[PDB]
Symmetry: C3
Subunit: 103 residues, 3 copies
């Protein structure tokens, strides 16, 4: 039920705006921003490159639907990367804090 959601963004500005918005709105309890990424992906049968930052979002499956909505709104690109990885287990007290602070 708890999840670590990955989202990449084009700038520190967007990274912080999204991280703050998600935590403020209780759609996530914690968000880690990892700067300096190089992203290589396919677009129109063409391999392109971009500079990005990674957001690691600690949330839940119940908040995810709302999280996607808020992210698509704040994110500048039409089809933003938003993928959730399941949390199999962890520090019990940490996960409780995670649920306790997510809506």
């Amino acid at each position: 039920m708890e999840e670590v959601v990955l989202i990449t963004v084009p700038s520190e500005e967007v990274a912080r705006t999204i991280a703050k918005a998600l935590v403020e709105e209780r759609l996530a309890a914690c968000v880690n921003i990892v700067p300096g990424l190089t992203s290589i992906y396919r677009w129109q049968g063409e391999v392109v490159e971009d500079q990005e930052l990674l957001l690691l979002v600690k949330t839940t499956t119940h908040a995810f639907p709302k999280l996607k909505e808020r992210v698509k709104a704040l994110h500048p690109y039409t089809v933003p990367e938003i993928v959730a990885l399941p949390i199999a287990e962890g520090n019990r007290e940490y996960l409780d804090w995670l649920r306790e602070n997510t809506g």
Copy 2:
């Protein structure tokens, strides 16, 4: 059964101490330290920020209970982030090495 455990820490000092302790004690076969994170989380109905490093720990569900104990002991904060993500599949020889070196 094999897992990638995420742990964030406040300094390079703690990052290295925990990484070394886990590998030395065979509670993990490998630990990756990613520096330069910005963390934004909720605390007392207040969105706060911190500078951290991320540890990506390659371990197993059997070692996890012991890993949590050692991490809570070494980690300076009371409720440290310790979340395990399940490994669905991977390089067979790598995963064997992972189990072979984890207790």
Copy 3:
């Protein structure tokens, strides 16, 4: 079915070569390169250290077998780290793009 595959490499050179090769060959739709990692692992009952970069690969279980083959070929080390984490859910349009561009 969709997965986020983690791979660590010894240099930016290898990181880019593998990222490009996987996307070009439609074995992945996107690859993120995170530089500056410190890796601590066990080798011959000895805890060693290395400088690496992390590749976060967006792919599928159907492409994984082929991905492993290509990675082992391009990667300079015999037993490279290749671990897949399952994607529980995500931006539907993003995941479709992911499958649509992976073979």
